[PDB]
Nucleic acid binder design. Structure first.
Length: 37
DNA sequence: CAAGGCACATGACAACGGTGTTCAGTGCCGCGTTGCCCGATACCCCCTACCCGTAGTTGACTGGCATCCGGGCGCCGGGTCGCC
């Protein structure tokens, strides 16, 4: 919580795992699995 | 000389004269009110032209922005970490 809220938003993005090909195709596979569920 | 007879006029008698008034009827000219006739005007319809909202567009493309000082000036007031 500081001034210039865009900076705090950027930190809120933080460090998250960027997705390579197989990672995201598996994610979409389980996405459609949950959709069918 | 007195009584009885005839003329003219006379107390009323209605009805004309002429003119003024009566109900009434109907108009005769003045003032105001009325049905027409149209004409325009609001108000339904149909047609399409155009404004405005929604939904797609697949090489890849993964963290920015320029701040800010030459007030100036002082106080309040609170926070804030050293201090022993």
């Amino acid at each position: 919580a500081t001034a210039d809220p865009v900076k705090d938003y950027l930190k809120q993005i933080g460090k998250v795992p960027l997705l390579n090909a197989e990672q995201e195709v598996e994610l979409a596979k389980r996405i459609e699995a949950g959709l069918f569920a």
